[PDB]
Amino acid sequence: ALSEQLAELEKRSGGRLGVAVLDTATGRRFGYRGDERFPMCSTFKALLAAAVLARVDQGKENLDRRITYGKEDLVDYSPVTEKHVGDGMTVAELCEAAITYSDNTAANLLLEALGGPAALTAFLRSIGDNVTRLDRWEPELNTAAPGDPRDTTTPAAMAATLRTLLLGDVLSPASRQQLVDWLIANKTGDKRLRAGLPADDRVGDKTGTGEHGTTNDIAVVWPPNHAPIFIAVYLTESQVDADARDAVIAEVARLIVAAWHHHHHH
Ligand SMILES: [Mg+2]
Ligand code: NA
To answer: What is the distance in A from the centroid of ligand 1 to the CA of 72?
Structure first.
């Protein structure tokens, strides 16, 4: 049923919709185009923060190190970093801005601190993700050209990598919890998966937004008294407007809730 419902939602969107879910309480998993590539856009920033935290755990980076930068480093969509040219920001403040506001300059400064897109990709390979690839910087990585494998993931690989990072022992307990806390504090996803999930659930998420009608959201969801559910949703080549694309994502969450046994709103 869920596959046919998502096929109909995909038709409404006019684009290509990818979904992956895994429930760590029951083990139930689901995919719709789960092995097809989609542009990550800003969903990669969750993985970037994880790679930075791994360097902190190794003593190669410090969350309190202050990065100064200039006006010339600002790229489009930098709501936090544009306020701190004068004083700089610490590595922790840049991770917070990249995840919770999707700040693009913060992501570029963190990519520079990591060594670049190949460093992030090599980190992902080292933790068992053989799919996801980062090739470019902000804002070019949001081009989302159909057929272009640069800066892509698959819904199943991204949800699997989130499980490794948030439940596995890749990161120290402090770093793992910090990453979770940043995702829980996200400010950009209120109209996406969060809008379709039960109000009692605790949610961390990272959105992505790009050209070619690309709207994405990846989330870790804790229902009360319940091991977490991981959800990755990618929508691209969509023909409907930005609010309608957000509503597609929220509807995926509602459809997952409806298909899940014993789960409901209210
Ligand atoms: Mg359950
Ligand atoms: Na400066």
So the answer is: 49
Counting DSSP H helices and E strands in the chain, the numbers are 9, 9
The Cα 38–Cα 237 span in angstroms is 10
Nearby residues of 62 by Cβ (< 8 Å), 6 or more positions away: 56, 91
Peptide bond into 149 cis (omega under 30): no
Cited resolution, angstroms: 1.4
- Tokens standing for 24? 């760590």
Q: Which of 3, 13, 42, 172 is catalytic?
A: 42
Question: What is the 257 CA–ligand 1 centroid distance (Å)?
Answer: 10
| Token pair in block for residue 127 | 């933790």
Which secondary structure element, helix H or strand E, spans residue 110, and what is its range?
helix 104-114
Domain ranges of the chain: 1-266
At the topology level, CATH places domain 1-266 in Beta-lactamase (3.40.710)
Report the alpha-carbon distance of residue 129 to residue 146 in Å, rounded. Answer: 22
Give the span between the Cα atoms of 165 and 198, in whole angstroms: 25
CB 129 within 8 A of CB 152: no
As a whole number of angstroms, the distance between CA 20 and CA 157 comes to 9
Q: How close is the Cα of 71 to the center of ligand 2, in Å?
A: 7
